[PDB]
C-alpha cells in the first residue's frame, strides 16, 4: 500500500531518486533516498553547556575553585585523569594542575602576576587541602607531622 500510494502520486515506487551535487553539478550515481521525516529538537541547547573560566570564586574550607555552571566553576580533574596524565612522562603538567592552577594560594597569585608580566613560570609551594587534612587528623589524638 505504500507503493500504491507512491504511484497515486508520480514518484518512483523504489522510493529513491537521482540527485545532483550543488558544488559541481555532476549526478550522483547509485540513486539515493530522499523523503520527509519528522525531526524534533531536544533542549540540550549548546549555549546552556558552553562554559569556561579564567579565575573566580574559591571555597573557604578548602580553597579549591567552586563547581558547576551556575557558579563560575572550574572543571573536575578527577582521579582517572591523573592516572592517564601520569602514564605519559608528564610530570610538570600534573604538578601545576594541582598546586598552582587549583590550590596553592601564594603560588597562584604569583602565577597571575608572572602571566601578566610575560614570564611563563611557576613557584610550586604546598597545597592547602593537605594542611586541612593535617589539622583534621591532628585534631584526633594522632600526632601527625613532617620531619626535616
Amino acid at each position: 500500500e505504500i507503493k500504491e500510494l507512491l504511484k497515486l502520486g508520480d514518484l518512483p515506487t523504489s522510493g529513491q531518486i537521482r540527485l545532483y551535487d550543488g558544488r559541481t553539478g555532476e549526478q550522483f550515481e547509485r540513486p539515493v533516498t530522499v523523503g520527509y521525516m519528522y525531526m524534533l529538537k531536544l533542549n540540550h541547547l549548546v549555549d546552556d553547556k558552553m562554559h569556561a573560566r579564567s579565575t573566580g570564586s574559591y571555597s573557604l574550607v578548602t580553597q579549591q575553585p567552586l563547581g558547576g555552571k551556575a557558579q563560575f566553576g572550574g572543571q573536575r580533574f578527577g582521579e582517572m585523569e591523573v592516572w592517564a596524565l601520569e602514564a605519559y612522562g608528564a610530570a610538570y603538567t600534573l604538578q601545576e594542575m594541582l598546586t598552582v592552577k587549583s590550590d596553592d594560594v601564594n603560588g597562584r597569585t604569583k602565577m597571575y602576576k608572572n602571566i601578566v608580566d610575560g614570564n611563563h613560570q611557576m613557584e610550586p609551594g604546598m597545597p592547602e587541602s593537605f594542611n586541612v587534612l593535617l589539622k583534621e587528623i591532628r585534631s584526633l589524638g594522632i600526632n601527625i607531622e613532617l620531619e626535616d
Binding site: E29, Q64, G89, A91, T93, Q95, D103, P127, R138, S139
Partner: protein, 1335 residues
C-alpha cells in the same frame, strides 16, 4: 624542603603545648552583634581576630596597631590567615576512651589486656566492675565483677583491695603494665608453646608489645583526658558558598561534649548519688565517641532528615573524604567544557576552539600583551578594552594562540589515550571541532558527548604537551602495538567502493600512461571508476641500504586503484592496493607504512586517506533503500517444512512415545537447523545477485547491494545483523536463561507481531541493565588494579640475569591459539636460540626481537625460546629495561623511567566493560609423540596406556607441535609412537563411564577378602546376569568391616604374589566400594579387561577473582613429596591418608573428605607437585610447590583465555607485571645468621639484600618462602600508610601505623601527588635521581 612524614600517638602534654587556651563555654555567637563569645567556641582571644587587625571593641583598625594585643579582650592584632591554623583544647573531667583503639577489629586494647572485647566494653559502659590489684584475696588482676558480686565481695572483703569501673580503671590498668618483662615472659611461653593456634595468638601479642616498647609510646595514651579542638575557619558556623547554606555540623557535636563535660564538673560540686555521676560519665564517653567516629558505636545520631551527621573521621573515609575528593582529584582553573563536532577539514594536530571560550581562557595572556604594547595603562583599562571586544583584541588573540597547545579530555578516562594535546584554530560557534580519526581514542560518538579543555601555563607544560601528548605522537595503543588511527566507518566505505571492479563498465580495456591519465578519464566522465584496465605504474623500493630504487611496469588494475595509488607514499609495494580494500586491509596498510617508512609519512598518509575516503564516499551517493533488504523466496518453504516436522514430534510425545525434555531438545535442534539454513540461503542470495553480461552472455560477481557493501567492507555491521534484517531472528532467551520453543520467524522488514516484540523487549532490557552494572563493577576493578601496582618505575637497563620463561605457542589441542611470533614479538631473549640443526645458533643471546628476527625464526621452524621476563627480574625497587621488552607505543626498548605499572593497570582494565557477565579424532597429518607414558599391549593387539600424566603431542613433519590431547588411565591407543596419522580416524578411546583398573602384570585373581555381610554383597547382574558381586562402600557396610576393607592380593596360579615387573611389590590394592567384579575368581587375567568397575564463571568476575587469588571451592590436592600412599583411620571427622617418601621421612599425614575420588593409588610413586584429586586449582599451592614460573604462566594463560573469547588483544607484559607486584611478601622460616623472626613477613627485596649483605661474608643468610597475596591485600599491606590510607578503610591502616609510629619517605607516586611534587615518572624521574643523589 621536608623529608618523610612521621606519625605517632599524642601525649596529653603535646595537646596542651599545641593549644592556645582552654575552650570553656558551649555557646558561640552573640546573636545580635555576630561577635564571638567571651570564651566560646569562636572567641577571638583563643584563636585570633575575626577580621584583619581588629578587635570586637573597635580600638585597633590599621597597621598603626600591628602586633600589640587589645586591653579588654586582649586579642593579639595580626592577619586573619592565622585564624585558620590555631587549635584549642577541652579539658575533660572524667577520662575517656578513643573509639578507634577499641573497636578497630582487632582492638589494640582488647589484645593488650587479653580480655574478650565484651568485657572491656561492659566495663566502659558501667555494667560491671574490674579487679585492679586483686591483692591478698581471691580476686584476679583482670577479673570482672557484676554489681551483686561487687557488693558481696565488699561485704566479705571491704578491705583496701581496689575495684572500679569506667575509663579510669582501664587507664590505671594500662598504667600498671610493665612491658619488657611481659615481653620476655611471652617469648618464653611461645618457645614452650606447642599448638599452632595459641602460638599465633601469642606471636601477635608479642609483636604488638614489641611495637610499643620500641617506639616512644605508652599504653594509657590511648585513653583521652585532653581533647584538642579544630580551628574555627575549618568549620565556620555557616560555610556560605552561595546558594544553599550548609551547617558545618562539627560545631554541634563539639557543643554537646563541652555541655556534658561542664555538667559533670558541677555535679562534683553537688555530691550527687554516684549512680547519677556514673550515668553522666557514661553519657560523656558516648558523646566523645560519637564525635570522634560516629556509627562505630551501636546507633549513629541524626540531626534531621534521619541522615546521620558526619563525625570527624567521616571527613576522611568514603568517596568524599579529603583523600578521594580533594587530595587526588581537585577542580582546576583555566578550563572549559563544551559539546563536540567534526570538522573533517582539520589536519590531525589541530582542533576547533570557539572564539568566546578562547577569549575567556587566555585572558591574563591578553592583558599581558596589551600592557606590553602600551595599548593601556592600568589593568582595568585592559579589562574594559577586552570587554568591549574591540577589533584589536582578535589579532592579539590569534597571536597568542599560535603555538599554545590545549589539552582535550573526555568524561570516563579509561586509558592513556583519553586525554590528548592539540593546537587550536578559532571557530565561530560554541562547539568544539574534532578530527574524525581521533574519535576512536576518545570513544566519542556525536550523540551529544561533551568534552573538557585545559590550558598549560609554564614552559615545561607546553614542551611536554607538545612532545609527549600531542595527537601526532600517539598512534600505537600502548596495550598492543596495533595502530589506533584506523579510519573507522565512512572512510572505509568510500575506499571500498572506490577500489573495486565492475565486470563490464564504460571505458574499459584501454591502456593508460600513468595515474594522472586515470584521474582525468574519471573526472571527464569518459570512463567509469571500477573498470578493468591495464596501466603503467612505477614503484620505488628501499631494498638498498636505505635507498629507494625505482622500477616500472604495466600492471592490470582498475581505474580506482590507479587513482588511489597517487596517495601512497614512496616506498610501498603496489600489491598493497590491487585488492578490494576492506577495513582490516587498510589498517594493515597503515601498519606496513609505519614499519617501513617511519612516523611523519605515516600520519601524512593517514590524513590523505581520510580526505580521499570522505571525498569518494560523497561522490558515491551510497544511500540505503528499502529494497536493499531482500528475502529468499524459499524462506517460507524452510519455515513451513520446519513447522510441519515439529508437529510430528509433538504428537509423538503426546501419544506417549518419548519424554518431555527429549521432545524439547528436539524442537530446539530442528529450529536451530532451520535458522542456519535460512541464514545461509539469504546470505548467499544477497552476496551475488549479480547476473550481468560482458560482451557475451552473462556472468556473476560480488554484488553491489549497499547493505552488503556495508557488511563485507567492515564498514558497519556483521552478518548477524543482516540475518535479523532479512531472515528470521534467532530464538530469544528467557528471564531464567532458558530458551522458548518457538522462535521469532519474522524480521525488521516484515513486522514482528505483539508477542515477539514482547520477548525481544525482555532480552533488550536485560542487556541494558547488564551494561549499567558492568560499568559499575569494572570501575572498581580497574581502581584496585591501578592501586596495587601504582609504583613500578623502570630504574635500570639490565638486571644482569639469565632467567626467563620458555615462551612457546599455545595450542588448545586442535587449532593453534597463538603463533610464537606474537608471544615474543618485541621481547628480549635470554639465551641465544639454536636452529633445528642443533649447535647452530640463529640469533644472539641478548637481542631485542623486532620483526626481522620474528620472520627469521618463523621460517626456520623454531618452537620455543627462553625469553626474559619481569616476574624474574633481578632489581630492587623497580625493573630493568631489558626484562620488560619494547615500549609497545614506540618501536624501541622502553626508556629508563617510564611508569609501566600504571599503563599496565589501565591496559588490563579498559576493555573490562566489553566482557560479559571420548577419543582423539585427529584431523591433521604429522608425527606422534607421547608424554609421561606407562602402558601395556593388550590381548586385542593394541597398546593401552595406564597412567594419568599421559599426553599426546602431534608434531608436523618439521618438528613443531601442532596438536595435543589428554588420554586417561587406561586408554587403548590405536597406533604406537612415531607413526604418522591421517584425518578422521581415532587414535585411542576408553570408557569414561567407569574406571579401568587393569593390572600391569601376568598372574591370577581370587574372591579373597570379599565376604558378604561384612565386606561385600551378593549381586546378580540385572542386565546380563553373570555374578557381579559389588563391594558396598565402607560407610554402607557393617561397623566391624568399615575399617576392614577388602583387597585382592594379585598372585599367580601358585598363590605367590606376582611381582610387578621389576618391582618387589605386586599390585596389592584396596579395591574401594562400588568396585564391581563381574568376572569370576581364579580366572587368568590378560591386559585388556578391567579388574573392577566403578561406574560413572567466564565473565569479568573470573578476572577479578583470579587477580584476588580467591581459593576455589573444591581444590585439587597435590603431592608434597614422593613415595607411596596408604590409608588408615577411617573418618576421624574426615578420612585419613598418609604418604611416605622413597628415602626421606614421611611428613604428610592429612585429612581428606570422603567424597574425594582419589587419583593416585597406594603402590603408585609420585613426585612434588603431582596431582592427587580433581577439580579447580589453588594458586598458592602452585607457587609453593611447582615454583614461581608455574604460577605466572598459569595466571597469564587463564586471563588471556578470558580476554581472548571476546576478541580483545592484550600483550602479556602487563599481566606479568601485575603478578610481579602480587607476590612481594616473603615469610622466613630460618634466620640463618640474620636477625629476623620466624613468622613475620618481609619485603622480598629487603630479605634479599639482607642475604646479599650477610653472604658478602661467609655467614649464612635466611631461608624463606614467597607467598601469593591478592591485589586487595598486598595494596593495604604496603610500606607506606598514606598510600594505603588513600585506598579503602583508612581507619584500620591509620590506627595501626599510629600505634607502631611509622615513617614514610614517599618513594612512590600516589603519595608524592598528595604532597604535590614532581612524581618520579617522567622528567620527575631525573629530578628525583638528582635530589636523592644530593644525599
Amino acid at each position: 624542603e621536608f623529608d618523610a612524614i612521621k606519625i605517632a600517638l599524642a601525649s596529653p602534654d603535646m595537646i596542651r603545648s599545641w593549644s592556645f587556651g582552654e575552650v570553656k563555654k558551649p555557646e558561640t555567637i552573640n546573636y545580635r552583634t555576630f561577635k564571638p563569645e567571651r570564651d566560646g567556641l569562636f572567641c577571638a582571644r583563643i584563636f585570633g581576630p575575626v577580621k584583619d587587625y581588629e578587635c570586637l571593641c573597635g580600638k585597633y583598625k590599621r597597621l598603626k596597631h600591628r602586633g600589640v594585643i587589645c586591653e579588654k579582650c586582649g586579642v593579639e592584632v595580626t592577619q586573619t590567615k592565622v585564624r585558620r591554623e590555631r587549635m584549642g583544647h577541652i579539658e575533660l573531667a572524667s577520662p575517656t576512651a578513643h573509639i578507634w583503639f577499641l573497636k578497630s577489629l582487632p582492638s589494640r586494647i582488647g589484645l593488650l589486656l587479653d580480655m574478650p572485647l565484651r568485657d572491656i566494653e561492659r566495663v566502659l559502659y558501667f555494667e560491671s566492675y574490674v579487679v585492679i590489684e586483686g591483692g591478698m584475696t581471691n580476686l584476679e588482676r583482670q577479673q570482672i565483677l557484676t554489681e551483686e558480686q561487687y557488693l558481696d565481695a565488699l561485704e566479705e572483703f571491704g578491705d583496701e583491695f581496689d575495684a572500679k569501673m569506667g575509663a579510669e580503671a582501664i587507664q590505671a590498668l594500662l598504667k600498671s603494665m610493665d612491658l619488657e618483662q611481659e615481653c620476655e615472659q611471652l617469648r618464653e611461653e611461645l618457645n614452650e608453646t606447642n599448638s599452632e593456634t595459641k602460638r599465633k595468638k601469642l606471636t601477635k601479642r608479642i609483636k604488638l608489645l614489641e611495637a610499643f616498647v620500641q617506639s616512644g609510646n605508652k599504653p594509657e595514651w590511648m585513653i583521652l583526658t585532653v581533647l584538642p579542638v579544630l580551628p574555627p575557619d575549618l568549620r565556620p558556623l555557616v560555610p556560605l558558598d552561595g546558594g544553599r547554606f550548609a551547617t558545618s555540623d562539627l560545631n554541634d557535636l563539639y557543643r554537646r561534649v563541652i555541655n556534658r563535660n561542664n555538667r559533670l564538673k558541677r555535679l562534683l560540686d553537688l555530691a550527687a548519688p554516684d549512680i547519677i555521676v556514673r550515668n553522666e560519665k557514661r553519657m560523656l564517653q558516648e558523646a566523645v565517641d560519637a564525635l570522634l567516629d560516629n556509627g562505630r558505636r551501636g546507633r549513629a545520631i541524626t540531626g534531621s532528615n534521619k541522615r546521620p551527621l558526619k563525625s570527624l573521621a567521616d571527613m576522611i573515609k568514603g568517596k568524599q573524604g579529603r583523600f578521594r575528593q580533594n587530595l587526588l582529584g581537585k577542580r582546576v582553573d583555566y578550563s572549559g567544557r563544551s559539546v563536540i563536532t567534526v570538522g573533517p577539514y582539520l589536519r590531525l594536530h589541530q582542533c576547533g576552539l570557539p572564539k568566546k571560550m578562547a577569549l575567556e581562557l587566555f585572558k591574563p595572556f591578553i592583558y599581558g600583551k596589551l600592557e606590553l604594547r602600551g595599548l593601556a595603562t592600568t589593568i582595568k583599562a585592559a579589562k574594559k578594552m577586552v570587554e568591549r571586544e574591540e577589533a584589536v583584541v582578535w589579532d592579539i588573540l590569534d597571536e597568542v594562540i599560535r603555538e599554545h597547545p590545549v589539552l582535550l579530555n573526555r568524561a570516563p578516562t579509561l586509558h592513556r589515550l583519553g586525554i590528548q594535546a592539540f593546537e587550536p584554530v578559532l571557530i565561530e560557534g560554541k562547539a568544539i571541532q574534532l578530527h574524525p580519526l581521533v574519535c576512536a581514542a576518545y570513544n566519542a560518538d556525536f550523540d551529544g558527548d561533551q568534552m573538557a579543555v585545559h590550558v598549560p601555563l609554564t614552559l615545561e607544560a607546553q614542551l611536554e604537551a607538545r612532545a609527549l601528548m600531542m595527537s601526532t605522537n600517539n598512534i600505537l595503543s600502548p596495550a598492543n602495538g596495533e595502530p589506533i588511527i584506523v579510519p573507522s566507518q565512512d572512510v572505509v566505505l568510500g575506499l571500498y567502493y572506490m577500489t573495486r571492479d565492475c565486470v563490464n563498465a564504460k571505458g574499459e580495456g584501454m591502456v593508460l600512461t600513468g595515474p594522472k591519465e586515470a584521474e582525468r578519464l574519471y573526472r571527464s566522465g569518459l570512463a567509469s571508476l571500477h573498470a578493468r584496465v591495464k596501466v603503467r605504474i612505477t614503484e620505488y623500493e628501499k631494498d638498498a641500504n636505505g635507498e629507494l630504487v625505482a622500477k616500472t611496469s604495466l600492471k592490470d588494475t582498475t581505474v580506482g586503484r590507479a587513482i588511489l595509488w597517487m596517495i601512497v607514499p614512496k616506498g610501498l609495494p603496489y600489491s598493497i592496493v590491487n585488492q578490494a580494500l576492506g577495513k582490516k586491509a587498510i589498517s594493515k596498510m597503515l601498519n606496513t607504512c609505519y614499519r617501513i617508512l617511519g612516523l611523519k609519512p605515516t600520519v601524512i598518509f593517514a590524513d590523505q586517506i581520510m580526505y580521499t575516503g570522505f571525498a569518494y564516499a560523497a561522490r558515491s551517493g551510497a544511500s540505503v533503500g528499502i529494497d536493499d533488504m531482500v528475502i529468499p523466496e524459499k524462506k517460507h518453504e524452510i519455515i513451513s517444512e520446519a513447522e510441519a516436522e515439529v508437529a510430528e514430534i509433538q504428537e509423538q510425545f503426546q501419544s506417549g512415545l518419548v519424554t518431555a525434555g527429549e521432545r524439547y531438545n528436539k524442537v530446539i535442534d530442528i529450529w536451530a537447523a532451520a535458522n542456519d539454513r535460512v541464514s545461509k540461503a539469504m546470505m548467499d542470495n544477497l552476496q551475488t545477485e549479480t547476473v550481468i553480461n560482458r560482451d557475451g552472455q552473462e556472468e556473476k560477481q560480488v554484488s553491489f547491494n549497499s547493505i552488503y557493501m556495508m557488511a563485507d567492507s567492515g564498514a558497519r555491521g556483521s552478518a548477524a545483523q543482516i540475518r535479523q534484517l532479512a531472515g528470521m531472528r534467532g530464538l530469544m532467551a528467557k528471564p531464567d536463561g532458558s530458551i522458548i520453543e518457538t522462535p521469532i520467524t519474522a524480521n525488521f522488514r516484515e513486522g514482528l507481531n505483539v508477542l515477539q516484540y514482547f520477548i525481544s523487549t525482555h532480552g533488550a532490557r536485560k542487556g541494558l541493565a547488564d551494561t549499567a552494572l558492568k560499568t559499575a563493577n569494572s570501575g572498581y576493578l580497574t581502581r584496585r588494579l591501578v592501586d596495587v601496582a601504582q609504583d613500578l618505575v623502570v630504574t635500570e637497563d639490565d638486571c644482569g640475569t639469565h632467567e626467563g620463561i620458555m615462551m612457546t605457542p599455545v595450542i588448545e589441542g586442535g587449532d593453534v591459539k597463538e603463533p610464537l611470533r606474537d608471544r615474543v614479538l618485541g621481547r628480549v631473549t635470554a639465551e641465544d636460540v639454536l636452529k633445528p640443526g642443533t649447535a647452530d645458533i640463529l640469533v644472539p643471546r641478548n637481542t631485542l626481537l623486532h620483526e626481522q628476527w620474528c620472520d627469521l625464526l618463523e621460517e626456520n621452524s623454531v618452537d620455543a625460546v627462553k625469553v626474559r621476563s619481569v616476574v624474574s627480574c633481578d632489581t630492587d625497587f623497580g625493573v630493568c629495561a631489558h626484562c620488560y621488552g619494547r615500549d609497545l607505543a614506540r618501536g624501541h626498548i622502553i626508556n629508563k623511567g617510564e611508569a609501566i605499572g600504571v599503563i599496565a593497570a589501565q591496559s588490563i582494565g579498559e576493555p573490562g566493560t566489553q566482557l560479559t557477565m571420548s577419543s582423539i579424532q585427529v584431523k591433521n597429518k604429522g608425527s606422534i609423540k607421547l608424554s609421561n607414558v606407562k602402558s601395556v599391549v593388550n590381548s586385542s593387539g593394541k597398546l593401552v596406556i595406564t597412567s594419568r600424566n599421559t599426553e599426546l603431542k602431534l608434531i608436523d613433519e618439521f618438528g613443531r607441535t601442532k596438536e595435543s590431547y589428554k588420554v586417561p588411565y587406561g586408554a587403548v591407543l590405536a597406533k604406537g609412537d612415531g607413526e604418522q596419522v591421517a584425518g578422521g580416524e581415532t587414535v585411542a578411546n576408553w570408557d569414561p563411564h567407569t574406571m579401568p583398573v587393569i593390572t600391569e602384570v601376568s598372574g591370577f585373581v581370587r574372591f579373597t577378602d570379599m565376604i558378604d555381610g561384612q565386606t561385600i554383597t551378593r549381586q546378580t547382574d540385572e542386565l546380563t546376569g553373570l555374578s557381579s558381586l559389588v563391594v558396598l562402600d565402607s560407610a554402607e557396610r557393617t561397623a566391624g568391616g568399615k575399617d576392614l576393607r577388602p583387597a585382592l592380593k594379585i598372585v599367580d596360579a601358585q598363590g605367590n604374589d606376582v611381582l610387578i615387573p621389576g618391582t618387589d611389590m605386586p599390585a596389592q590394592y584396596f579395591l574401594p566400594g562400588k568396585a564391581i567384579v563381574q568376572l569370576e575368581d581364579g580366572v587368568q587375567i590378560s591386559s585388556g579387561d578391567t579388574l573392577a568397575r566403578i561406574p560413572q564463571t567466564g565473565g569479568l568476575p573470573r578476572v577479578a577473582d583470579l587477580f584476588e587469588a580467591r581459593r576455589p571451592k573444591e581444590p585439587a590436592i597435590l603431592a608434597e613429596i614422593s613415595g607411596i600412599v596408604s590409608f588408615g583411620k577411617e573418618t576421624k571427622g574426615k578420612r585419613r591418608l598418609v604418604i611416605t617418601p622413597v628415602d626421606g621421612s614421611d611428613p604428610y599425614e592429612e585429612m581428606i573428605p570422603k567424597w574425594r575420588q582419589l587419583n593416585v593409588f597406594e603402590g603408585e610413586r609420585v613426585e612434588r607437585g603431582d596431582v592427587i584429586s580433581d577439580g579447580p586449582e589453588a594458586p598458592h599451592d602452585i607457587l609453593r610447590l611447582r615454583g614461581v614460573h608455574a604460577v605466572t604462566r598459569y595466571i597469564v594463560n587463564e586471563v588471556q583465555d578470558v580476554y581472548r573469547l571476546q576478541g580483545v588483544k592484550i600483550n602479556d607484559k602487563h599481566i606479568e607485571v601485575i603478578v610481579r607486584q602480587m607476590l612481594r611478601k616473603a615469610t622466613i622460616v630460618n634466620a640463618g645468621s640474620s636477625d629476623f623472626l620466624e613468622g613475620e613477613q618481609v619485603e622480598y627485596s629487603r630479605v634479599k639484600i639482607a642475604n646479599r649483605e650477610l653472604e658478602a661474608n661467609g655467614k649464612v643468610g635466611a631461608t624463606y618462602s614467597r607467598d601469593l597475596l591478592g591485589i586487595t591485600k598486598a595494596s593495604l599491606a604496603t610500606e607506606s600508610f598514606i598510600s594505603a590510607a588513600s585506598f579503602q578503610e583508612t581507619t584500620r591502616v591509620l590506627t595501626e601505623a599510629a600505634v607502631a609510629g611509622k615513617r614514610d619517605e614517599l618513594r612512590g607516586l600516589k603519595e608524592n601527588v598528595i604532597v604535590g611534587r614532581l612524581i618520579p615518572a617522567g622528567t620527575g624521574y631525573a629530578y628525583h635521581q638528582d635530589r636523592m643523589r644530593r644525599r
